[PDB]
Structure 1
Amino acid sequence: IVRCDERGSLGTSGETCRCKNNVVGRLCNECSDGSFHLSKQNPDGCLKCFCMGVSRQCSSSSWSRAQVLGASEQPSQFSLSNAAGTHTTSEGVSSPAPGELSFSSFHNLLSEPYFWSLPASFRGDKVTSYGGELRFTVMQRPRLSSAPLHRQPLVVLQGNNIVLEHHASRDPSPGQPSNFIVPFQEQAWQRPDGQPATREHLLMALAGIDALLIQASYTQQPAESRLSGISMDVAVPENTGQDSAREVEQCTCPPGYRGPSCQDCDTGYTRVPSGLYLGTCERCNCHGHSETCEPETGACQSCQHHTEGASCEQCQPGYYGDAQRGTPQDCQPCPCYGAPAAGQAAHTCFLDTDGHPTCDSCSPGHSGRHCERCAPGYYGNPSQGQPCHRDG
């Protein structure tokens, strides 16, 4: 009899092994191409590499698990929001202990569900939260007359133009605390219309969290809402002593990408809004004046050769030429004489329609394209060195 792998088999015709979708091998104990992390709990056996669509080669991160705690954040940093985040406030939010939050001024709010809006340390790039959990305790009380709400999200995750929701199997009873454990796995999230989350979509939201919202109202007329014991799983490169983040994909990215899922443009590359996921990463457009730029916006950085602008497209003041040509000598020093008018920093001049510079920040009582003569009712010779003083 063959002993089929317990993590990877669906069953056994005693002499053959039947593998889950993403599993391969005689004993169904290997992940298929584009898969990683064999586990018994995964019905498909192995997760699929996603890698923001730019790679199919990945394996389990060996980052360690750690938690972001609510206690880590100033209570000032918590607030209430509607789902749309068009109505927010922290007026009334108080904290009786660190990481514990309390609210009881619903009279000041409109008649819609409000959420606790977790602060920044819970947002941004949380791809490594995949395969972990958001944990928390809530307690709620309605005003005397108030039915629960119907089908309301316990948690809303918003990132990268995706909204996913997690709905609780039970509502918290009035005036007693409930522990929730929300897994970062597709099975636990749906779109607002109630379509299942995909792995790809959960990852894209997690990679760019803009809001992470916990239900605070629960009923139509809430009296009181309290939040505590907030714990969000992540993964860090440092060893922490906790298990490694095996569900977190470590992709081999192509040139121009980094992050464990190729979610970031690498040094010398910037985001291009393309199609399907986050877009693609292309090389900086810096007119040859730079190799580094803002990964998301595109703005060039540390423009060389006396250039400036978002593409290093212009010569810095005190220089003239065509920075767009792309050579180191593109921009030349303005050949002006004397002091700049209204006592300026440097001298401005521009490349005139004749291929030669003209100075346009000449001092008063200067003249000519290089500020080299003196205006009428003035005297002196700047070329030789003297300034220009007025007549009498």
Structure 2
Amino acid sequence: GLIRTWVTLKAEQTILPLVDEALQHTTTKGIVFQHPEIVAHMDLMREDLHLEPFYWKLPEQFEGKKLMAYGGKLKYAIYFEAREETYNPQVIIRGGTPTHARIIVRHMAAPLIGQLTRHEIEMTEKEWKYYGDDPRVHRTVTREDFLDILYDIHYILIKATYGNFMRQSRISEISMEVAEQ
């Protein structure tokens, strides 16, 4: 076909949970919609603030048989405020048939404080790395592994916690390219 589509959030889904890297817990207590940005404010989550760093767990429509995504472009905009401005992975994906379930990460430059910054992440092996490998290692994910993750995505996470002592964090414009025929 060559029918370029984008998965995005349902207009109705106006809230996006926070999670630790572990996905051991989830928080909503401090998250609110303020069109278009979706906002997590720390002061409404003080009870939970040790479980940091936090990631946004994208909703199920990004998960699953997503082989067609391999074209490219995971897109989203990020904004945040913290006391000062300075390792942790920008985005995190897990997926696979049990025999090949594995976790990979994408590292990027920390976004600036106060400046809404945009990310577009190419959905291909060449730039991702392996969870558990220090970011300074020059190994990247094999095409083969990558594709086996896409074959069934378990979850995609995007960094919510930034700088030092963070006040609030906003994410918007969330989309990922797929394909139809």
| TM-score using structure 2 length | 0.86
Q: Quick check: which has more Rg, 1 or 2?
A: 1
Is structure 2 residue 92 aligned with structure 1 residue 156?
Answer: yes
Other structure's SS at 1:136 match: strand
Output the aligned Cα RMSD.
1.7
Among 35, 41, 45, the alignment partner of 1:97 is 35
Among 130, 139, 143, the alignment partner of 2:79 is 139
Q: 1:221, CA displacement in angstroms?
A: 2.2
Q: Distance in 1 between matches of 2:85 and 2:77?
A: 21
Q: Which has the higher contact order (CA 8 A, sep 6+)?
A: 2
**Which letter maps to 1:104?**
H
Q: Look up the match of 1:217.
A: 161
What percentage of residue pairs aligned between the two structures are identical? 31
Deviations 1:48-93 (A, max 9, x none): xxxxxxxxxxxxxx341100123545124x1101111002112221
Kept in 2, the 8 Å contact 1:112–1:220? The answer is no
Q: 1:187, CA displacement in angstroms?
A: 1.3
Q: Which runs of 5+ in 1 are unaligned?
A: 1-61, 238-392
Other structure's SS at 2:179 match: strand
The within-5 A match list for 1:229-248 is 229-237=173-181
Deviations 1:268-316 (A, max 9, x none): xxxxxxxxxxxxxxxxxxxxxxxxxxxxxxxxxxxxxxxxxxxxxxxxx
Q: 1:110, CA displacement in angstroms?
A: 1.4
Q: Look up the match of 2:55.
A: 115
The within-5 A match list for 1:195-274 is 195-237=139-181
Kept in 2, the 8 Å contact 1:65–1:234? The answer is yes
Q: Distance in 1 between matches of 2:12 and 2:5?
A: 16
Q: Distance in 2 between matches of 1:174 and 1:93?
A: 19
Is structure 2 residue 109 aligned with structure 1 residue 173?
Answer: no
| Greater share of residues in strand | 2
Other structure's SS at 1:229 match: strand
Kept in 2, the 8 Å contact 1:141–1:175? The answer is yes
Q: Look up the match of 2:13.
A: 74
**Which letter maps to 1:109?**
L
Q: Distance in 1 between matches of 2:12 and 2:95?
A: 21
Q: Look up the match of 2:69.
A: 129
Q: 1:132, CA displacement in angstroms?
A: 1.3
Is structure 2 residue 27 aligned with structure 1 residue 83?
Answer: no
Kept in 2, the 8 Å contact 1:73–1:119? The answer is no
| Greater share of residues in helix | 2
Kept in 1, the 8 Å contact 2:85–2:112? The answer is no
Kept in 2, the 8 Å contact 1:111–1:220? The answer is no
Kept in 1, the 8 Å contact 2:66–2:150? The answer is yes
The within-5 A match list for 1:1-392 is 62-70=1-9, 72-76=11-15, 78-97=16-35, 100-105=37-42, 106-107=45-46, 108-142=48-82, 144=83, 146-148=84-86, 151-160=87-96, 161-168=101-108, 170-192=109-131, 193=133, 194=137, 195-237=139-181
| TM-score using structure 1 length | 0.41
**Which letter maps to 1:181?**
E
Q: Distance in 2 between matches of 1:115 and 1:188?
A: 20
Q: Aligned residue pairs: how many?
A: 169
Relative to structure 1, is the Cα distance of residues 139 and 93 closer, same or farther in structure 2, using a 3 angstrom cutoff?
Answer: same
